[PDB]
Amino acid sequence: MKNILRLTLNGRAREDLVPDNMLLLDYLRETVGLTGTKQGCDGGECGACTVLVDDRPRLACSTLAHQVAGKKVETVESLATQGTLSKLQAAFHEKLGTQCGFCTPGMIMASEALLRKNPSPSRDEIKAALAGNLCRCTGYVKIIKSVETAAAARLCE
Amino acid sequence: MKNILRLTLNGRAREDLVPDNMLLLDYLRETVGLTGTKQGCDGGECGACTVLVDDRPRLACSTLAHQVAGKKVETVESLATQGTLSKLQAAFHEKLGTQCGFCTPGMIMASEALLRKNPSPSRDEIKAALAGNLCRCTGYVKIIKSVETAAAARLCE
Amino acid sequence: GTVGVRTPLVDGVEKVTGKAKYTADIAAPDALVGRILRSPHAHARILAIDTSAAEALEGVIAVCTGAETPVPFGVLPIAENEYPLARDKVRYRGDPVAAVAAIDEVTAEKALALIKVDYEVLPAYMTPKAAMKAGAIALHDDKPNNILREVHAEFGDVAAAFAEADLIREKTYTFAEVNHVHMELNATLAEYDPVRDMLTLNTTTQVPYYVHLKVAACLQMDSARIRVIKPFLGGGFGARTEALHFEIIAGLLARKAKGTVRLLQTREETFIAHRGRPWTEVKMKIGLKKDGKIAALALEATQAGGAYAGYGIITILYTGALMHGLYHIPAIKHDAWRVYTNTPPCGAMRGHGTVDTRAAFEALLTEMGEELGIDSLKIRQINMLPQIPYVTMYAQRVMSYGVPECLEKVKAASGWEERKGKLPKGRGLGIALSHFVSGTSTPKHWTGEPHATVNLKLDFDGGITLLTGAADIGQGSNTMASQVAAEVLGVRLSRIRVISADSALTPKDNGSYSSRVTFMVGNASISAAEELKGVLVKAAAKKLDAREEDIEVIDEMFMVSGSQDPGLSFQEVVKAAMVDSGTITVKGTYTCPTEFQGDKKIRGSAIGATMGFCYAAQVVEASVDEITGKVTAHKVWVAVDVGKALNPLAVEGQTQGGVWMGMGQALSEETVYDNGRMVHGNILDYRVPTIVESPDIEVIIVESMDPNGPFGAKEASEGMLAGFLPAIHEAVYEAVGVRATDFPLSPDRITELLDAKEAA
Amino acid sequence: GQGSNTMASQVAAEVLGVRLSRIRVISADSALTPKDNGSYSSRVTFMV
Amino acid sequence: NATLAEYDPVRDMLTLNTTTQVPYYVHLKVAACLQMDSARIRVIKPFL
Amino acid sequence: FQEVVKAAMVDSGTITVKGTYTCPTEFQGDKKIRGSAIGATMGFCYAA
Amino acid sequence: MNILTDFRTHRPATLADAVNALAAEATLPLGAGTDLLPNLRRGLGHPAALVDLTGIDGLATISTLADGSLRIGAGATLEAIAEHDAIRTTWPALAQAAESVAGPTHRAAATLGGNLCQDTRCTFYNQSEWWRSGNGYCLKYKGDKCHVIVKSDRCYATYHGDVAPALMVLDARAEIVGPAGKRTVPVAQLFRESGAEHLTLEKGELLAAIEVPPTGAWSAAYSKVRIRDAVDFPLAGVAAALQRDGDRIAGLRVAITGSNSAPLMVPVDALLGGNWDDAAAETLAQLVRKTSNVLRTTITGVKYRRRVLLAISRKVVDQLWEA
Ligand SMILES: Cc1cc2nc3c(=O)[nH]c(=O)nc-3n(C[C@H](O)[C@H](O)[C@H](O)COP(=O)(O)OP(=O)(O)OC[C@H]3O[C@@H](n4cnc5c(N)ncnc54)[C@H](O)[C@@H]3O)c2cc1C
Ligand code: PCD
Ligand code: PCD
Ligand code: SF4
Ligand code: FES
């Protein structure tokens, strides 16, 4: 059965009729058409579907869409200002924190949550916050470098 | 304000939260993403937005989405069976009843309504049914031939 | 200049914004849902299949079985024994038996449940030993003993070489099977146009040409009616270097349904596709002189290859091909057996077939060195190739060799001299060398075509379009091709727009496998750029009334050498070049010379033959917790000879990714089967390392300048993976005194070794 | 809508002795296709 | 009439899909009028 | 045709060719009367 | 679209409404869904409805009470627990255990109630519908045979929750609400050592809060063993609490997880009054071994899981002693 779901998504008010059993991941990819949020596993193991719900990370594949009613939801598509990259996005690009790009939307949303909560994280705090996000391309080294670079850039802005 | 709209569209059940002031044309093109139905004028003058509602033609630009609640709606995307053209579509293609193709979806939907109601129309009946559909490329000659060809082909089978 | 500049990848903007569309992101509102019915038995005959009830279900548009797929496929022309949908029997749990296309997921699931299959279950074999028993059923009729391929080679007089040795030791090492776990799930979007009888596929492949060939063959459809496009791809690491069953099945279903079918795969199904590194047992025997010089080598490798041939023949030859080209070894004896088992087929995975035997060789060499009282870094320096160029006994031609520098660099960066043997109990350092080819120099299909082809287009607007069939899989080939072409032309990287991997538009490429792309496509791109530069210099010279020989192109300006004239801007030259010409299209190609393709007298030597090798030396620092047996890799210092780093930023990232994948295999990754059932089919119990335990990795770039590579370049992505295993093996021995004989060195294995140590 | 993609395919297929179905036309995208002066004054069939 | 204009500020590139019979003339005038290098502009005519 | 394609790929790979057409000068009006270019053409379509 | 049964999702605003919603057949409580949704997606359960507890006002509060005890609503997230200043300072074992669970994003939403009530695990169970149906299902769900212990007298699935043992050695109490009203039990009593009926909650009952008493002279810690350094469930986990009097053990509590179908207290009275030395540590290992029943419900072997469970029980007590 479908019920009304009201929330703010990427800065815009949404009011949609959504199945009670719909996962947030499927609502974002299929109902809204925002394909930046990815599916990398069969449930909760990889972090590729990470999005923000009231500034905190959330696994879209392990959250029901109806559980985020009345909340602020943000996906990777929300970070840029029109076509201009956010500092965090520019850092992942310039420092090669992204190779194939598949784990990148999830890695960047987890990083965005970290930087909103802790603007100047230590290397260990970065590793701790990205602990559930798997990447197969990078060996993580340059992902840490991207987050450090972004943190510094945001602070001197 | 938005309200629940339930209808059958291209053979599938829809249950969406839709603004009370939304035109059927905008619901089809923007909410559902079916771009076959076109806009050729500023309101009711050209027939390019013609769709079927309970087997009869309707101008999607001059109908509110909420007025088709509980009805069967069909657009050009519904006529083929998977990728196989219907006899009417095949006739417009083979007889050149379509050149630029812009008036074609509306012209075909008006023709489909005609053939469902009157399987063997005279040339005068074909012209009468398509009277409100404007085409700028064909001079109409081969559009009439297309409908006559489709009618004869449907009578076979 | 663009070459040698640290350059963010040209497609990175779309990755960080979520605008990049991977296969499952492509919109197709009319797409049906495809699903495959997979065998629940590891080995069984199919006696009958009734799809009548599934076909009758409203919403089911097509149902297919093996009766519709009479042509088998395989990546190697000589070994095509896998059918898209099974015929006669299934050979692993997960083998496709039927498939359906339905209007939605719930309907497709119901349909699968309505298909009735009558099976005659057969005994299944999980190990090479069980499969080779005289009474085992042959998985494939042409190999009654289940041995797909055997290799028995001897280079030099091995018996006499071992007689000359002062010390001879032998040890057996075992290596778990591992999987690529690319983060993107497998998927194919297949659009069949019944009006025109054409098929267009967007699929998760590193080898769109191979997909084109196998879809045409398996569907018995002319290649001219098929178009293959690779959209953005979420990695592959070898998994997607062969056309896979789901790609062909999606095409089959789309044609049967006369429409479009989107066939998505779960992570479990992606593990079932597999094509990963086989479980391998390696017996290693090395003879050394007392001064540390290698006198002889003899090794045996047995691989459990899974249920179908696939890359198997190539993989087993690689177990011995790269025992050559790294150290000078007087004589080598190689025996190997590739054995079928009733498990998902194994295939190519980063370092294809050379990882496990390289790990075993490095570990025993170090162990023997200890016995002789020679430092593990020194024993490698002692055995380096004595002169360059060097032709190996396997007929490989080494024209550039940065190993001496790699070793000196990691020795210094890691503080090896200062620290080795002077660490606290529980901590250790280890070193190892590894290498890989920069592309197999002989294509799989003999077609007589160039080994790479790149087209450039330049019209009135001044933008240069570079067209390549090469698959960028996250490694950066689109950036690489752009950089080398822009360098030749003297233009900014921003002037080049790359169109890639769409068969209707781009020139065919053999695929992104064996690290061939930079070397081959890089050279072809230089070739095309030189053709275009020639056309522009001709037009500039004419407009400047100068001779072509006197024209210099500096940062988008065509000047007359020595002259004072300001010269012509690039756009002014484009305008001049359009006169009496219009659109300029040029073609560049590259073909590996025959002397680099092995020796026909040495059977199978094309495998292992290449234009050049990437070499890597790495030192690993690790600690071991004796309470839990947990090994923690803290840091790796790795020096890689990549000939010339075209994009140092990407070379560093590629090297870190390669070392890290080796770390996963070394410490935590392993597949597990139980009477044919996959137990590790998720990313919780198949332990891909998280960022918390992953090591920091410092990369040092060595540039040996290969005489045939693009601007001197060799590969930069596979030669460093294997070295991590033996390096951390040595670090564990220094930390706690045990010598592992089985990978991964997970806590369970370490605690057993510690308990045995103490017991003794 | 006048048919220039069909016209171009027809004449190239005739010269080559192949079926029309063997020709795929990519048109009017400046990054991929050669510059054309435009569909005006009925110049396309004759010149293209 | 309609135009979809995609401007990429990261690369300073512009891609246009527009209702034109003369994509070459559009390319020339957009470059001149925006005082933007023609090499930074891509013009595509979709179905018209 | 397909056998010939296979043969043509040997030592070549992907074939790309270019064809062009240019109206001869005599069909461009009187070169000395600029306005005479308007109305000059390779040929006329006639209708009754 | 990812397939789920066509269940209803109730979002009660109070515990009373949640209890009434749970009265219906085939209805399950839902916390953040980090354990439940992956299982439902794999076909482990075919609910008619889920009762979301995350929308209940006041269910996520962490507070201190008059006596200096701790009260945590069942809806509090593991992240909030791990980061709470009072918990880290006074009941560090609980912060330690909460922070050790899964990954940081799971903890950002995962609830204390859901962590305690998480399902047991087995490699024949946490598998897809295709996989399980092909294997004839099992006694825990849709089958009639246990593939680990063929006798099949019960399901032997293992409980791998990290927070339970920490709360057990801290002598925490569980407040339960249901159609019969409110009741409280020592947290250890929330569990039953049976793989397929592992909780003592009855129909319609919910864990509403957890109360932890002041510590007095007790110190406590939790230690978890896993191959990766994040995300993995415990291969073995041991919590311990100690009261030390001079050089003798005045009080000792030990709880294990990741070893049996329930997290369990280990009877260690034999160590009271004695010293903490090598002989006492070996005695402790044997007592832990006796209570443990390490079985092959895991992909990792029993030999290692049992060996480390014994080793860390000695290590966690030695840590508390030496501090
Ligand atoms: C990849 C992965 C790794 C994990 N690693 C760990 C780990 O290391 N340690 C660990 O302990 N867990 C782990 N988990 C399990 C789970 O994520 C955590 O246990 C968690 O705290 C679940 O809480 P939740 O709110 O998400 O519960 P849910 O998933 O919502 O619920 C789980 C269960 O508790 C019931 N339930 C929820 N709230 C209540 C209540 N108040 N009263 C009664 N019943 C209730 C539900 O009906 C359900 O059966 C992991 C999960 C995944 C997917
Ligand atoms: N000298 C030099 C070289 C190189 N480079 C760089 O680096 C890269 C890479 O390169 P190479 O090495 O040449 O390679 P290629 O061939 O291109 O590619 C392929 C590969 O790639 C690699 N990497 C990667 N990454 C990602 N990210 N993903 C992936 O998936 C991968 N995979 C892997 C593999 S495994 Mo096989 O398949 O087993 O055979 S092979 C392989 C490039 O692109 C660039 O960026 C540079 O710069 N320089
Ligand atoms: N001989 C011959 C000729 C021709 N054809 C055909 O016909 C067509 C046409 O051609 P042509 O005539 O050449 O033309 P082009 O150039 O191509 O085109 C253009 C034109 O086109 C026409 N037509 C049409 N149609 C449509 N449909 N739409 C349109 O829009 C149009 N427009 C119109 C106009 S006006 Mo101007 O612009 O004023 O100058 S110019 C014009 C072609 O394509 C084909 O199809 C043929 O076949 N044959
Ligand atoms: S322990 Fe036995 S009954 Fe329980 S889940 Fe595992 S196989 Fe099924
Ligand atoms: S898709 Fe893997 S955790 Fe959500």
Ligand code: FES
């Ligand atoms: S960039 Fe490829 S998985 Fe992370």
Ligand code: FES
């Ligand atoms: S758009 Fe013209 S009548 Fe509707």
Ligand code: FES
């Ligand atoms: S076909 Fe062009 S308007 Fe009718």
Ligand SMILES: [Cl-]
């Ligand atoms: Cl290998």
Ligand SMILES: [K+]
């Ligand atoms: K046999």
Ligand code: NA
């Ligand atoms: Na049907």
